[PDB]
């Protein structure tokens, strides 16, 4: 039992890692605000939010193009091509725009947060800031956490808006369905509180998980050049399993 002991030692250190990351989160969100902390938050909205705007916009257009092309082939055989705008908008708003925009946020803006905090730990800027008398959990970590909780629900709304515009462009303007029936069938079956707000509630839960993992792995890193790179691929794996895992739980409550 040489590897069986190695396997059991592995999952104990991972259980203990969730305990450190839970106490690290309660120390950030339960503390008083300080001086100059809003301006550090607006700077990190540029690095997390605005830098992710180009991958999110082009990926939302490409997904709406496939939905309008595949959804026309199903509906035209049952005489319901007027329900194309209903199925395109309801597939994005409740399934695809919360989930696919959280898998591209964990790859771009999540893995770049655990490389920036991890190279501050290697070059000893976090130990130099602490010996001056400034907590690096408040100065460095806390603006980066709040900038990810705000930027991902702002980016799935832009994801869903171009997905519907991209699906209208292939459906109405190329395959030739009626434009007035596209929007009227959408305004009839899509509700705001049950379909649009329930997609924002999903992406706030995902933004908390994708950013708390990305911030923890850079802080509790191994300050060694291939200990940082091992941590960057842990935030892409752990965030993708948590996004797909919490997605089943949230649809069974909201739409079950």
């Amino acid at each position: 039992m040489n590897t069986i002991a190695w396997l059991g030692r592995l999952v104990i250190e991972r259980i203990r890692g969730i305990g450190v990351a839970a106490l690290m989160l309660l120390q950030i969100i339960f503390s008083l605000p300080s001086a100059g902390g809003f301006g550090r938050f607006v700077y990190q909205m540029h690095r997390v939010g605005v830098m992710s705007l180009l991958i999110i916009t082009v990926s939302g257009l490409f997904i709406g193009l496939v939905l309008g092309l595949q959804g026309y082939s199903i509906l035209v055989n049952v005489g319901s091509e007027s329900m194309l705008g209903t199925m395109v908008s309801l597939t994005l708003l409740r399934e695809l725009a919360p989930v696919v925009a959280a898998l591209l946020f964990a790859g771009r803006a999540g893995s770049a947060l655990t490389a920036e905090i991890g190279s501050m730990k290697q070059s000893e800027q976090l130990a130099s800031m602490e010996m001056i008398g400034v907590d690096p959990l408040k100065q460095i970590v806390s603006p980066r956490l709040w900038a990810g909780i705000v930027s991902l629900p702002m980016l799935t709304v832009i994801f869903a808006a171009i997905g519907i515009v991209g699906g209208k462009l292939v459906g109405v303007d190329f395959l030739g369905v009626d434009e007035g029936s596209f929007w009227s069938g959408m305004q009839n079956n899509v509700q705001f509180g049950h379909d649009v707000v329930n997609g924002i509630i999903k992406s706030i839960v995902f933004a908390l998980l994708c950013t708390w993992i990305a911030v923890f792995q850079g802080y509790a890193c191994d300050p060694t050049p291939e200990g940082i790179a091992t941590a960057m691929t842990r935030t892409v794996v752990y965030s993708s399993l948590c996004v797909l895992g919490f997605d089943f739980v949230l649809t069974a409550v909201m739409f079950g």
């Binding site: 203990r16 890692g17 450190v20 739980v249 079950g256």
Partner: protein
């Protein structure tokens, strides 16, 4: 402090399991979230398309769920067990006394006065203490049926109330049913 942090990491996992089973209960996939649901049952002759965890409605408003369907091969009639609801398929003392003084005078009416011995509503005192414990709003000759939710939707059980002076206690068997309408054999006759 490896043990203090390990105990927090176990408490997060157990909290993530307890949130999972709370979400399955709210969703309806496991458990029964209604209101002090008692149990009735009934015996049909065709329950095709009826699944467990289906719907029971009175006049279109949902009053229960289905629990299980078994066959009983000696009589070859299916036996649907369904649990209803205490909050809205029964009544309380303000309505219960409203049918306490009703059922005493209506059952012992001008006809049934000269039909028994001179008790002078002495037997009307015995019947009302059997009334209050465990009574439903389902009268004695309401009939339950298998309806079909639109034109193509799933199947549910509909309780159609009508008439009735006596009422059913909590746990009895509804004695007038009709099963699902075989839309094959409807067209087989119509040719």
């Amino acid at each position: 402090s490896r043990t203090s942090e390990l105990a927090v990491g176990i408490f997060v996992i157990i909290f993530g399991i307890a949130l999972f089973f709370l979400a399955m209960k709210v969703s309806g996939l496991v458990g029964t979230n209604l209101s002090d649901g008692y149990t009735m049952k009934a015996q049909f002759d065709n329950v095709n398309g009826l699944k467990p965890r289906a719907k029971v409605t009175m006049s279109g408003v949902t009053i229960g769920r289905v629990d299980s369907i078994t066959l009983d091969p000696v009589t070859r009639l299916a036996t649907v067990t369904f649990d209803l609801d205490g909050k809205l398929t029964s009544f309380n003392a303000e309505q219960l006394k409203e049918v306490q003084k009703n059922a005493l005078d209506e059952l012992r009416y001008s006809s049934d006065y000269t039909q028994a011995t001179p008790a002078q509503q002495k037997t009307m005192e015995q019947q009302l203490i059997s009334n209050m414990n465990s009574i439903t709003s389902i009268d004695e000759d309401a009939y339950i049926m298998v309806a079909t939710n639109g034109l193509l939707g799933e199947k549910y059980l509909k309780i159609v109330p009508g008439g009735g002076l006596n009422y059913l206690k909590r746990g009895d068997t509804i004695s007038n049913t009709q099963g699902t309408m075989d839309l094959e054999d409807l067209i087989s006759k119509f040719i």
